[PDB]
């Protein structure tokens, strides 16, 4: 849930005003997703979110 809260805060910050420190967090999350989409897809299914 910490990652979910961080992503929610980053998207909230990206709106209203378009800063760079929050788009940095968005890019970090996108990099994490790119790393994740290189292995079995069923790993994300089940277990910790």
């Amino acid at each position: 849930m910490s990652d979910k809260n961080l992503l929610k805060r980053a998207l909230l910050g990206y709106s209203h005003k378009r800063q760079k420190s929050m788009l940095y967090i968005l890019g970090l999350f996108k990099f994490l997703m790119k790393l994740s989409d290189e292995t079995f897809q069923h790993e994300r299914l089940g277990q910790f979110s």
């Binding site: 709106s15 209203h16 378009r18």
Partner: protein
């Protein structure tokens, strides 16, 4: 009468995603030049 009707409408106003999107679009894109000039005026120091 207009003021009373405005109060009646605004007291029971409920937030809407479309209305919030419109207000965000205005205050972030439409009035951008005006707020830029406002920030210009605010962030200037004048010494005598």
């Amino acid at each position: 009468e207009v003021l009373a009707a405005a109060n009646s409408f605004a007291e029971n106003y409920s937030a809407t995603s479309q209305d919030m999107d419109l207000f965000q679009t205005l205050t972030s894109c439409t009035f951008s030049k005006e707020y830029a000039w406002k920030d210009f005026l605010n962030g200037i120091h004048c010494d005598v």
